[PDB]
């Protein structure tokens, strides 16, 4: 009973069984500061049964540094009491409660227990109980730019899925007597040694079709081995194999046992000696707090640092830790003890929430067991960071001033950022900026653009939007929400509903871009990413890119004159199937879904567009007769949808749907089998219908069958929608109408001058004149996946399953059909939180203006397996032009609006280069091989005049520059690459 209208994107990541187990699990969260509230928010959005909060400590001002459910009017009230009311709104299916006191036995009511802001003695006391009662225990800590996570799920944790990947499947070609399974031509199985597979549809070895998993021994990218199959048979042909994923048993140690001998998870392999240091440092922090009435070391205090290092020495000696302590790093941990950064809180909250979901679902591989992380490269170096500048000022930014200082706070408060997109990452970024205080100064400003509107499925991971906000613009709602979070942003945020692209350069022009400080992408497609990257490269602005997919995520940073741009690297492209496979020879459900989508477009979209364009454009027929590749098809569509097959009631729609069923599931198959009988052979003597080609069989319409009735209903409803008739759903009318249907006879055709144009003319003049039909239009069907009442997904599912039944393919359900046809991207709130945290950790590096390329980090992670990795950005390539060092990416030529001849002469005299090609946009302004007359015509014109003439479009008044690409050759004739030209109009 999962509400798929809300958990649509999350179910594609977790699944129905995982969420069913989640909806029966209780989570207790101790601590309600930034880390605790982040964890609770992610858990509530995920959909656990309930959440309980325990934090009786009264609120303080500094707590607002990363707690976004606290306001300055809540000072002196317990944090949990003021946070529960705001947490209860995120999800209506997840109650949120508060407990004023905790007893050990009270812990038995919870599936998972998360602990933050708790001393080590209390953690040991809680874990000693949870471990022996088999309760998942998670403990998280965030100190300045340092973080730690600890997981303990019990001694006999059972993990059903260890990587989150779909089971591997493949088509076999032959299985020898010794178990050597071979894949089809140029197909990779993708298995690893030790995997288990099960076979089906294997001919010649029926014993392999029982379904018993067998060990796999990989012998190459195309073949593997399963053992000895001597008894079962001699040799097997064809068939399919599917991977079997077996449960695993993971044994955890208690906190008390693991303190002495910890097991580390390394977020970065570049610094593998640090986690042993942090293990001692955090325990020393706990001891110091215990020795000072629960007070942490003061910011940038040397006396406290010395005492903390003494505690570290004592702990290292006590635990027989044979590790040399790095004094600088440990004292750095001491200095930032009171730091509370929203970015670290977001990062650790996403990670810990994912761990909680793993505990409650027994899915994905959990952390085992200590995860120590630092982002110490973000510490500013262009400002003074000392005890004087880091002391608290009694403001909401104390938690951040304790790490960065007041001068860096002034630097942050005067930022002028530009955020593209307002989706999940956009909402997280806006929250982080509001908490950090970005653009709260006199000269600060934030601009956010997004042309989309809020939908129900977006509320699952975009926590700034509520059910009352459905149907409104994302940017306005996000700006209002963050103005509520941080009142100082009132009037410092501007929201646009503009799509960022070539058509919006009148708004985001030179004046708009020249005032920015950085650009942050929160998009979901590569085209927009590339466009924004090109704009940032032209204007020389820092860019922060980030992306997520299910449990995976990445973040990249582009810095002017230092690194390469976003578009300098290539990504794998989308897979599109051959047309011959979709048209005639499908063998996967994806092929049939693509065919069904094309059928939907061709039945309910294209003919309607042709009919409407015929009734609007006065010269449509003549243009179509010589423009389209098949004017006959257009004429036939117009005739059929206007006169021949125009319905007058719903009964005619039902009859039309029956006829289309016959056309697409019974007659085309008969024709195909007439052309290639099932016993036919190829030119080499092999059987034709073997391997990837499956012999189809015609379908006979049966009203009682569910799929046939579903197709009839959906097709009739969509046709009625096209013609605006009143559809119905009672089966009685369908059964009555379809009873009296006489199929026209059909016989496959064996085949065996210029009059065709005359026939086309006769058809064209037979159509009713446009004048006779004024104000009459047919409503086309625009595909929409998120609405479950327009019959689009119903029709696509029915057609796909019927075509699968034709070719003996296993049908899919509406869930998978919507996933495939809709091009849905799986999304999670935890991944969004992690990527926003990483991006905001890079933002402070950008604000500080770091110059070295080793100080920046591009990040990649997969939370399903607990993998984090970071790497320095790639430096922009250099080149030599006329004996000068030129940056291939960030350098350009600046020239006035001269003539083409003057431009060529300038490049000849100055750079010693001969211009061979000059282009602007998608036009060739000049080429060395053009005829002399054309050149002599185009030479004495200014560049702006030349562009206007060639493109046949005047430059807009707001256009202030032109970008030209130039290819030139040197004196010897060798082609030399040069940067682009920026002509100033």
């Amino acid at each position: 009973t999962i509400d798929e209208g809300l958990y649509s994107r999350q179910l594609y990541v977790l699944g129905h069984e995982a969420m069913k187990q989640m909806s029966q699990s209780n989570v207790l969260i101790i601590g309600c500061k930034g880390l605790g509230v982040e964890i609770a928010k992610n858990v509530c959005l995920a959909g656990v049964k309930s959440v309980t909060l325990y934090d009786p400590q009264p609120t303080r001002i500094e707590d607002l540094s990363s707690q976004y459910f606290l306001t300055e009017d809540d000072i002196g009230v317990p944090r949990a009491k003021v946070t529960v009311s705001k947490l209860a709104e995120l999800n209506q299916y997840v109650p949120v409660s508060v407990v004023d006191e905790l007893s050990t036995e009270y812990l038995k009511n919870f599936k998972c227990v998360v602990v933050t802001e708790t001393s080590l003695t209390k953690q040991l006391e809680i874990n000693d109980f949870t471990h022996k009662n088999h309760i998942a225990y998670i403990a998280a800590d965030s100190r300045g730019l340092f973080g730690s996570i600890f997981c303990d799920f019990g001694e006999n944790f059972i993990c059903t899925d260890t990587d989150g990947n779909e089971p591997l499947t493949g088509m076999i070609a032959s299985i020898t007597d010794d178990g050597v399974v071979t894949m089809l031509e140029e197909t990779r199985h993708g298995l690893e040694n030790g995997d288990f597979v099960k076979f089906t549809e294997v001919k010649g070895m029926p014993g392999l079709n029982d379904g018993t998993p067998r060990k796999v021994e990989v012998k190459g990218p195309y073949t593997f081995s399963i053992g000895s199959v001597k008894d079962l048979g001699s040799a097997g042909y064809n068939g399919v194999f599917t991977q079997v994923k077996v449960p695993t048993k993971i044994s955890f140690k208690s906190l008390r046992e693991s303190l002495k001998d910890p097991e580390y998870v390394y977020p970065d392999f570049g610094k593998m000696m640090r986690p042993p240091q942090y293990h001692i440092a955090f325990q020393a922090l706990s001891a110091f707090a215990d020795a000072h009435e629960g007070s942490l070391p003061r910011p940038r205090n040397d006396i406290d640092a010395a005492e903390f290092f003494e505690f570290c020495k004592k702990i290292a000696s006590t635990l027989q830790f044979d590790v040399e302590l790095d004094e600088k790093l440990i004292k750095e941990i001491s200095y930032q003890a009171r730091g509370d950064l929203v970015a670290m809180s977001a990062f650790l909250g996403g990670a810990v929430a994912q761990e909680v979901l793993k505990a409650t679902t027994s899915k994905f591989y959990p952390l085992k067991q200590y995860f120590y992380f630092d982002s110490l490269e973000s510490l500013p170096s262009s400002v003074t960071i000392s005890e004087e500048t880091c002391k608290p000022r009694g403001c909401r930014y104390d938690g951040q001033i304790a790490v960065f200082g007041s001068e860096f706070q002034e630097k942050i408060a005067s930022l002028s950022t530009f955020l593209v997109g307002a989706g999940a990452i956009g909402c997280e970024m806006l929250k982080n900026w509001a908490m950090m205080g970005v653009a709260t100064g006199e000269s600060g400003h934030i601009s956010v653009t997004d042309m989309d509107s809020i939908e129900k499925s977006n509320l699952n991971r975009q926590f700034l939007f509520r059910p009352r906000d459905v149907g409104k613009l994302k940017s306005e709602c996000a700006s209002t929400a963050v103005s509520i979070m941080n009142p100082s942003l009132t009037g410092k945020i501007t929201s646009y509903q503009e799509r960022v692209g070539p058509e919006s350069e009148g708004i985001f022009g030179d004046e708009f871009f020249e005032k920015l400080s950085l650009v942050t992408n929160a998009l979901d497609n590569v085209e927009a990413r590339m466009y924004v990257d090109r704009r940032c490269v032209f204007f020389e602005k820092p860019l922060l890119e980030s992306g997520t997919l299910g449990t995976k995520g990445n973040t990249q940073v582009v810095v002017p004159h230092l690194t390469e741009s976003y578009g300098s690297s290539q990504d794998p492209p989308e897979k599109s199937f051959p047309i011959c496979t979709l048209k005639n020879f499908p063998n996967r459900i994806e092929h049939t879904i693509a065919w069904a989508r094309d059928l939907f477009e061709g039945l309910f979209k294209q003919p309607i567009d042709n009919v409407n364009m015929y009734l609007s454009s006065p010269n449509f027929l003549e243009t179509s007769l010589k423009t389209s590749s098949n004017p006959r098809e257009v004429l036939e569509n117009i005739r059929d949808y206007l006169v021949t097959e125009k319905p007058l009631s719903f009964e005619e729609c039902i009859m039309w749907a029956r006829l289309q069923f016959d056309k697409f599931f019974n007659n085309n198959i008969q024709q195909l089998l007439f052309n290639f009988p099932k016993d036919s052979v190829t030119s080499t003597g092999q059987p034709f219908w073997s391997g990837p080609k499956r012999a189809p069989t015609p379908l006979s319409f049966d009203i009682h069958n569910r799929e046939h009735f579903d197709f009839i209903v959906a097709a009739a409803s969509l046709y009625a929608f096209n013609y605006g008739l009143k559809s119905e759903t009672d089966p009685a009318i369908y059964e009555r109408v379809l009873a009296g249907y006489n199929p026209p006879p059909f016989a496959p055709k064996s085949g065996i001058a210029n009059k065709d144009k005359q026939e086309l003319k006769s058809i064209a003049d037979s159509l009713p004149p446009p004048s006779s039909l004024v104000g009459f239009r047919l409503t086309p069907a625009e595909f929409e996946k998120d609405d479950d009442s327009n019959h689009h997904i119903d029709f696509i599912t029915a057609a796909s399953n019927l075509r699968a039944m034709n070719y003996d393919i296993t049908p899919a359900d509406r869930f998978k059909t919507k996933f495939v046809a809709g091009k849905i991207v799986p999304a999670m709130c935890t991944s969004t939180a992690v990527v926003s945290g990483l991006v905001c950790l890079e933002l402070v590096k950008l604000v500080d203006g770091k110059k070295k390329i080793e100080e920046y980090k591009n990040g990649f992670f997969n939370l399903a397996i607990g993998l984090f990795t970071f790497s320095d950005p790639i430096a922009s390539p250099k080149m030599k032009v006329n004996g000068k060092e030129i940056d291939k990416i960030w350098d350009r030529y600046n020239l006035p609006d001269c003539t083409l001849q003057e431009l060529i002469d300038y490049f000849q005299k100055e750079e010693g280069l001969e211009v061979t090609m000059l282009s602007s946009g998608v036009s060739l302004l000049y080429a060395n091989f053009q005829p002399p007359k054309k050149l002599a015509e185009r030479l004495p014109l200014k560049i702006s005049e030349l562009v206007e003439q060639i493109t046949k479009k005047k430059l807009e008044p707001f256009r202030k520059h032109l970008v030209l690409e130039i290819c030139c050759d040197d004196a010897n004739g060798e082609d030399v690459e040069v940067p682009f030209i920026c002509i100033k109009l």
């Binding site: 011959c580 020879f585 098949n630 030119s683 282009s919």
Partner: protein
């Protein structure tokens, strides 16, 4: 993309393709009109076939869209001009030039592949009644590919 396209165009200009001639339409570098000459040792001998080539914005990282504009009676070319070529749908790599594509198309014209057809009826005619296929191909190339 512009620089790669211009390099290919210049390379075509330097060494003539002999049996083909591709160039931009008007002044647009992302829309070419190519011509292919029917192989002598084929039913399409003495025929001129016009193809439209559309380079995507991501070229050479996405395949060009190549469509026949002249009607051709081939087992692997349908009424819309679509060509059943692997290197144009999913085997495309940013290392293939337009000259290679034109050579592949000419080779396809010189010998069709009826075992994996795009037009099952023409493939059936080719496999069963070869002479009728030859006559139909000659008639179609005379009716459309000449003039």
């Amino acid at each position: 993309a512009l620089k790669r396209i211009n390099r290919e165009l210049a390379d075509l200009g330097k060494d003539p393709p002999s049996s083909s001639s591709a160039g931009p339409v008007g002044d647009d570098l992302f829309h070419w009109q190519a011509t292919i000459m029917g192989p002598a040792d084929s039913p399409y001998a003495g025929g001129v076939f016009f193809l439209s080539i559309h380079f995507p914005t991501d070229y050479p990282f996405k395949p060009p869209k190549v469509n026949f504009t002249t009607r051709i009676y081939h087992p692997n070319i349908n009424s819309n001009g679509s060509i059943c070529l692997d290197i144009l749908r999913d085997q495309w790599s940013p290392a293939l030039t337009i000259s290679k594509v034109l050579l592949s198309i000419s080779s396809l014209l010189t010998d069709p592949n009826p075992d994996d057809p795009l037009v099952p009826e023409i493939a059936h005619v080719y496999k069963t009644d070869r002479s009728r296929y030859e006559l139909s191909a000659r008639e179609w190339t005379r009716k459309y590919a000449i003039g």
